[PDB]
Amino acid sequence: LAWGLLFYPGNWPIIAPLHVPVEYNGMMMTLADLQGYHYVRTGTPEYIRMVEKGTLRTFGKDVAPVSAFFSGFVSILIYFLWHFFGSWFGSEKFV
């Protein structure tokens, strides 16, 4: 839970500048969106990008906290798994 819940807070002071909106050629874009539109990624076009887009079964913000918690829960499962995997990895057995 700590690992997931802290991830967005630990990053929001850095990216938040780039989330102020902009009326660019008629359309609302964040500055982050502007960066993507501007600095041409020839081999990484827009649809490849997997960001949130909304649902009819969804409520908007909050979307970040709800995701952070889900990440926290899956993160404990990943942790159990990866502790045992690590114990396995730290093994002095010979063959």
Nearer to other proteins, 13 or 94 (CB): 13
Helix, strand or coil, per DSSP, at residue 79: helix
| Window 4 to 23, contacts with other proteins (CB under 8 A) | 4, 6-23
For residue 93, the minimal CB distance to other proteins (Å) is: 14
- 50/95 with CB nearer other proteins: 50
Indicate the residue among 57 and 95 with the shorter CB distance to other proteins: 57
Closest to 68 (Cα-Cα) out of 1, 15, 18? 1
78 burial (CB, 10 Å; 0-12 / 13-18 / 19+) is middle
Contacts of other proteins in 34-63 (CB under 8 A): 34-61, 63
Return phi, psi of residue 30, to 5°. Answer: -80, 165
